[PDB]
Amino acid sequence: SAEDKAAVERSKMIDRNLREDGEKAAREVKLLLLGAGESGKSTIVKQMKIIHEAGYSEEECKQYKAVVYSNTIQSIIAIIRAMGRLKIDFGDSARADDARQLFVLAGAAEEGFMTAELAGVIKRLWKDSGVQACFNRSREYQLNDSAAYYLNDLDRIAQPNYIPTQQDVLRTRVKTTGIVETHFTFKDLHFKMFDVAFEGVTAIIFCVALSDYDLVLAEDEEMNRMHESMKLFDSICNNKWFTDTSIILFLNKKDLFEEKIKKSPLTICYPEYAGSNTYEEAAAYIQCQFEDLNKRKDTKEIYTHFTCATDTKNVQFVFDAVTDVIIKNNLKDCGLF
Ligand SMILES: Nc1nc2c(ncn2[C@@H]2O[C@H](COP(=O)(O)OP(=O)(O)O)[C@@H](O)[C@H]2O)c(=O)[nH]1
Ligand SMILES: [Cl-]
């Protein structure tokens, strides 16, 4: 049994015996978190802390509430502004005043905030048929993936005394810069996890936003996002430094993808795609497109997982499976400290 096989495997080790206090030494695992912007790397970092360490306590969550406000405000403003650039009128003409009031209020504030007035303005905008029609064309502009999440719970978020939930925090988009290092312990392995905006890397976890298949890059409107992370995977996966590195592929945002794929065709990303436009076929196709980039197949297996990184239980399940792979394949290259 897959987990037993890992337990057996680790029990074959004898290097702890070479240390005076071998049995309480720390077995160290260096893990690199890679992927395009907004692919989910920071979200996975949060999930490690939630799952393996303290968590995100309530006072920690309160620190994020203006971030939630800011995310919500950015989201609605992006949709309203797109309406203009895409020539979508408001379903109810009275909403043009709310749109203005949105800019008046955001225009005079210093950071993310929420008042009854502003909640009222945004909830009326979000309920409008025209705004909804613009929302449903978001692949044509740039919009936070959490737009719907926050805006549908606007009422809860608007409450005075609102206290951000874990899911609220997980759903935030926080501007990360440079390299973030996080430490946690799981199955007696001491993970050092690096999120890059390396030598002796035990494992790489490469994140892909599946839901990007119909989106265009932020910098350049004429540049398919999925293709960019492919070009990046290619480079990473076949990199000489990583031959003995377990390469794990998180095909992430599977929940957004499952919703997109119904009404938006894969052919946008891969024009040659000739399979049915269903979750099953299009997901598989994407997986095959990436895994096929592995130029040294005979001697390098890629471990692919379909994840929803904001879903704590899914990440725990997945990271558990990823950990048995490291324990079965890389343990001999992991030092004791
Ligand atoms: N619905 C959904 N949202 C996600 C998923 N993974 C990440 N997000 C959201 O996508 C946005 C960007 O994620 P982030 O982890 O910051 O990507 P990063 O730039 O690689 O660090 C955040 O608002 C996340 O909450 C997912 O699997 N499903
Ligand atoms: Cl308009």
| Domains within the chain, CATH numbers bracketed | 1-56+176-335 (3.40.50.300), 57-175 (1.10.400.10)
Closest to 252 in 3D by CA, of 296, 208, 200: 208
How many other CB atoms are found less than 10 A from the CB of residue 78?
18
Specify the residue with its C-alpha closest to ligand 1, atom 8.
40
HSE value, Cβ hemisphere, 13 Å, CA-based, for 321: 14
* Contact criterion met (CB below 8 Å) for 179 and 41: no
Which residues are bridge partners to 180 per DSSP?
195
Resolution in A: 2.3
28 by DSSP, 3-state: which? strand
Which residue puts its alpha carbon closest to atom 19 of ligand 1?
38
Structure determination technique employed:
X-ray
Query: CB–CB of 188/337 below 8 Å?
Result: no
Q: Closest ligand to 99 CA? A: 2
Q: Which of 68, 310, 314, 315 to mutate to test the pocket of ligand 1 (most atoms within 8 A of CB)?
A: 310
The pairing of strands 302-306 and 203-209 is unpaired
> How many angstroms is it from 268 CA to the middle of ligand 1?
22
3-state DSSP assignment of residue 336: strand
Instruction: Evaluate whether 270 touches 283 at the Cβ level (below 8 Å).
Output: no
Q: What is the DSSP letter of 307?
A: -
Say whether 95 sits in a helix, a strand or coil. helix
Phi first, then psi: give them for residue 196, nearest 5 degrees.
-95, 130
Residue 315 CA to residue 309 CA, distance in Å, equals: 6
User: How many Cα neighbours within 13 Å face the side chain of 28?
Assistant: 11
Distance CA 274, CA 73 (A): 39
Q: How far from the centroid of its chain's Cα atoms is residue 22's Cα? A: 37
What is the distance in A from the centroid of ligand 1 to the CA of 5?
A: 33
Separation CA 67–CA 172 (nearest Å)? 7
